[PDB]
Ligand SMILES: Cc1cc(O)ccc1O
Ligand SMILES: Cc1cc(O)ccc1O
């Protein structure tokens with residue numbers, strides 16, 4: 001039962017101008033309005049804006065933790081070096097019927113074809129990492145590309161933003177101006193006064209400022225590290241493009257403004273709860289649920305992760321703290 | 322009842338300047354320190370000892386620079402310190418059969434910052450102009466005679482410790498002519514080129530290498546194990562050695578020596594008694610272990626490169642004491 | 654005109670859990686400002702836990718005792734000015750067991766070491782609390798702060814209250 | 815004229831333990847060049863040990879397989895020229911148990927990750943082998959190297975073979 005590696009570039013469609021692609025038994029085609037998926041025995045359609053926003057995340061996150069559901073049918077499960085792609089795996093209708101379909105891939109093989117899909121299907125003026133009010137539209141025939149938008153380098157602190165050799169603070173000068181929906185956020189540096197010899201370990205930065213300057217939405221990015229404890233804050237606007245079903249607990253601390261989380265059962269997709277978080281609110285997302293957030297105004301969110309690879313197995317024998 | 326009260330002593334004192342010699346004497350607990358034209362003169366309740374002032378200053382320089390180091394720093398067969406890591410025992414005759422059997426050894430335990438402060442004042446006051454107790458005899462002047470100026474710069478050198486590795490961003494730097502570290506005369510033939518390092522964009526902070534033998538050839542002091550790279554408690558502490566290690570080191574853990582250039586001979590004695598046990602000759606590439614039950618003192622004719630390898634885990638000394646850790650790390 | 658809403662000890666508006674079919678306890682919902690406002694000064698109350706790792710909420714008020722830790726920690730200032738004072742310990746093993754986890758309170762008295770530096774944090778500023786350093790805080794007025802650490806001797810667990 | 819004597823795989827001169835009243839085995843005395851000369855290419859033989867920590871000696875010759883480690887390691891070249899290739903693993907946990915210690919041989923096959931860089935070491939040069947990276951070596955001519963690491967799946971112990979036992 002070895003992980004698959006078979007992927008293929010199919011033809012360009014003459015009318016639409018887009019290329020279609022194959023990964024194992026799945027095929028991917030887009031037209032003016034839709035991503036059209038097929039697999040052995042079934043088919044599915046996702047509006048292309050939702051699809052591209054979702055694909056942007058799975059790509060940027062390297063398949064992330066646990067389950068990335070594009071929607072109630074299609075998604076991926078990260079096995080960390082391998083990845084399952086599914087239609088209906090976490091949908092009771094498909095599963096009670098025996099109509100779910102899963103294929104396990106080597107992660108770099110699936111990632112390579114996902115990157116090609118994302119590049120080909122993204123048009124000039126359309127940034128699938130941005131909120132709708134910040135960017136153009138993906139509809140219609142192929143028209144140029146936005147490869148710059150979809151190839152942004154991941155930033156990850158090794159220990160903390162701003163430390164020597166570590167991920168830098170964001171400034172106008174290094175290409176990171178304050179986003180319009182955080183135009184009022186204070187931007188002063190903390191006062192840092194190190195004695196001679198201790199410059200490298202006396203360090204502080206304006207985290208709210210750094211987040212106010214994030215050039216993408218819904219992208220947890222590590223700012224500070226204590227062993228497996230990762231503080232991954234991010235700037236959120238509109239809707240989280242996926243329903244995340246994590247294979248471990250994760251916590252959200254709302255830093256500004258407000259987000260509402262739609263919480264559904266991880267396995268079935270059934271609605272379970274709705275969590276409203278305002279500035280200072282912290283809550284846990286248990287491993288047995290999937291969640292999707294809604295943020296009207298661009299807001300600052302701390303996603304707190306435990307990146308230990310031992311946790312998933314341990315949950316497969318609690319699911320809540 | 323004073324919650325500031327500790328078993329470990331804190332009483333030290335600057336005594337009088339001698340008008341004939343120009344030197345100040347000092348007191349730490351029951352111990353007194355006086356120097357004259359030739360000698361360090363030590364007293365404690367019930368006895369006294371003399372050490373030639375050059376040997377004494379070279380040992381004191383090490384004990385100060387190392388912050389009391391690991392385990393026992395014997396200045397000689399009588400006098401020394403034991404590091405307890407925040408506290409320190411100063412002794413006379415503690416590791417000497419003749420004193421111990423007769424019950425004439427004397428030990429006092431101090432808070433480390435208190436003993437260190439007076440040790441620093443002693444070193445500064447007793448070091449004279451042109452004398453560098455960190456240097457080999459051919460590189461420096463003489464400590465003899467009445468007080469004549471000072472060499473506070475030589476005795477105040479900043480300790481150098483890598484947090485991860487020499488040369489990494491924010492870590493201890495490579496040595497250069499430009500930053501005040503020219504190549505030592507007895508290393509004049511050592512190649513100085515840096516390794517080729519090409520990082521891909523975004524990875525410049527973690528693709529890192531440096532010329533360690535070059536870095537050692539520029540060490541401005543002798544017998545000063547200095548951290549160059551760290552893996553948990555594993556510390557690579559290389560140094561440049563010339564003449565005689567100014568102390569007999571009785572470690573409270575096993576430690577290892579890898580000879581990187583030229584040659585050293587180690588005089589190995591029993592840690593507890595000081596009885597000769599072995600003489601270890603190490604040439605380039607030779608690696609050996611110093612057992613936790615011995616003390617050692619090195620001899621290096623030509624300035625040489627030595628890697629001292631330590632395990633800095635604080636659990637070790639109690640384990641050795643209990644016999645839950647062995648006195649030799651490996652048997653075969 | 655754009656207004657970014659941040660919380661404060663004196664001004665927060667807690668959200669909550671709306672149930673369709675679940676147990677609200679599963680979400681362990683709290684507000685870090687409310688938690689800090691209800692704690693003693695410098696008391697470090699766990700508000701998030703994930704195995705051994707914690708987020709702690711605290712109210713800085715006046716001058717704290719000295720702390721040290723066997724691993725790095727981070728402090729994020731959430732409201733009000735907070736000073737961090739850092740001291741490099743001569744022998745950190747004398748104060749914290751290098752195999753422990755979580756911060757250890759090491760006393761009001763100045764520990765033995767060298768002055769490392771001073772940091773003044775305002776709302777939204779994060780500082781490194783590096784392993785090997787002792788640290789303490791000063792806040793002229795009550796201020797909220799958050800720690801990224803591991804559960805240990807100073808971690809207060811108040812899950813019921 | 816000053817001559818700093820350095821060892822090499824084909825030119826070293828071992829010293830040893832002179833006994834007054836002791837056992838030369840207590841000194842666990844070897845020569846890292848001799849050890850590297852007699853081992854298989856890239857075999858990592860323990861020459862020092864202190865609880866879990868090790869110094870390993872190895873001969874670099876040809877191209878090695880890939881290694882990775884759950885902690886930092888350092889390599890010091892002792893003789894010859896050694897090229898080091900570093901690769902940032904996409905998923906290091908797929909190759910190295912996070913609870914493991916010591917280097918892991920992760921195969922000759924190219925692991926999945928991004929190219930980090932290249933280092934060329936000569937005698938006396940040290941490189942960081944950072945946690946999270948895979949590394950491999952190339953030496954055109956035979957070379958000696960030392961690792962600062964922890965005992966694990968790759969460390970070969972043979973103290974009886976390499977150490978002085980008499981005299
Ligand atoms: C996946 C994910 C992204 C995000 O930006 C916040 C929460 C999440 O679960
Ligand atoms: C103390 C000490 C210093 C040194 O330079 C070499 C070995 C040692 O044991």
Ligand SMILES: [Fe+3]
Pocket residue numbers: 244246250285291
């Ligand atoms: Fe999530």
Ligand SMILES: [Fe+3]
Pocket residue numbers: 570571572576611617
């Ligand atoms: Fe020693």
